[PDB]
């Protein structure tokens, strides 16, 4: 009992709050209570961007957390919250976990330091592009792609996988983002 770890979290809605608590209780109902006793604290979302970093610092790091959780807000903004929390907790190399954010830039341990997520990103589904096209007697591609980082990463992944077949696509022409 004297050892007490302090896993924090950052969820979306207050109700999920309760869920989180009950979850961690199960993690103690089965595993032991001598050198452990995981203690769970959390916070809820804010819209003021820099307020995210300020709040996460002041609240979550004041309780010497060990690994923060992160999830998308109820209203979508593509990136929103993982960037501030990722940067702030990456100052001290405190590993965080993603829960929904499947966008491809994060999977680069040079601009995000420490970030482990639990859903494969968009780019990985490129593999399914291959396997399916491998089975339905097809060997030709005219793929389009955006110019954003997501498109670049997806096209590079597909080309790297496909060049193993000693083959290549026909055209890789890319349009500018937000075109009319």
């Amino acid at each position: 009992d004297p050892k007490i770890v302090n896993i924090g979290a950052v969820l979306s809605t207050r109700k999920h709050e309760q869920m989180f608590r009950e979850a961690v209780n199960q993690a103690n109902k089965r595993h032991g209570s001598w050198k452990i006793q995981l203690n769970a604290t959390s916070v809820t979302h804010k819209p003021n961007a820099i307020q995210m970093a300020l709040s996460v610092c002041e609240d979550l790091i004041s309780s010497q957390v060990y690994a923060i959780l992160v999830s998308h807000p109820p209203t979508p903004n593509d990136h929103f919250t993982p960037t501030p929390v990722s940067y702030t907790a990456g100052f001290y190399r405190i590993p965080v976990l993603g829960l929904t954010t499947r966008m491809s830039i994060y999977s680069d341990k040079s601009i995000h330091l420490s970030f482990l997520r639990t859903v494969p990103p968009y780019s990985h589904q490129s593999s399914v592009w291959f396997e399916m096209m491998r089975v339905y007697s097809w060997n030709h591609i005219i793929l389009l792609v955006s110019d954003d980082h997501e498109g670049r990463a997806a096209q590079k992944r597909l080309e790297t996988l496909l060049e193993e077949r000693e083959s290549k696509a026909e055209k890789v022409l890319q349009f500018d983002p937000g075109t009319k």
Partner: antibody
Amino acid sequence: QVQLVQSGAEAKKPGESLKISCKASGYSFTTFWIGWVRQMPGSGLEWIGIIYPGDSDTRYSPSFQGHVTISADRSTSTAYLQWSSLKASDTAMYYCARSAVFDYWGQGTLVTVSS
Amino acid sequence: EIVMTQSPATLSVSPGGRATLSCRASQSVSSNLAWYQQKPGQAPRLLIYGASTRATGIPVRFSGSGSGTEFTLTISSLQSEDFAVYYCQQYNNWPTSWTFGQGTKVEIKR
């Protein structure tokens, strides 16, 4: 800083029903696997039951099922021990321990069943 | 449903010696052991769990070792206010098993 004071001694003839307490203190009650053990005169110790006081989940020994029903209550943390009836050959002493590696035992409350 | 074997029974050491209490399982329990001391007219206490670690507020004279079978506890420099009955117990399938032992009994020599 944990005390597990038990209840006073008890003696009664065969047939009736028993009720003893293990009221705890000093720690968040609904997080630890309270259990019970029994010691007859000069043989050693054996296990009888265990209960998590957060979901009232319970389990029992290979041969103790149905004789004694363990309980709980989250108002004063007192973990009772309901006795069915009779059990004349049950003169022993009953301890209530805490954390499945049992650490913080309580007092002794011998139960006497004679004629 | 795991029987337990503890020997010897009435070890007797001079009041500066040591002890080599043994507790052997019937199967291969990796590390799920605990040792208990019970002085007369009292309720036992915990001193070792995990077959190697020490509890809180326990002197350094105690230490244990072993795995699989033939668990050993060695009291170093047996002081005077020893002489309690000892016990060993294991917890592998928990919570289902909780099988104790029979334990030895030290007796100082004067």
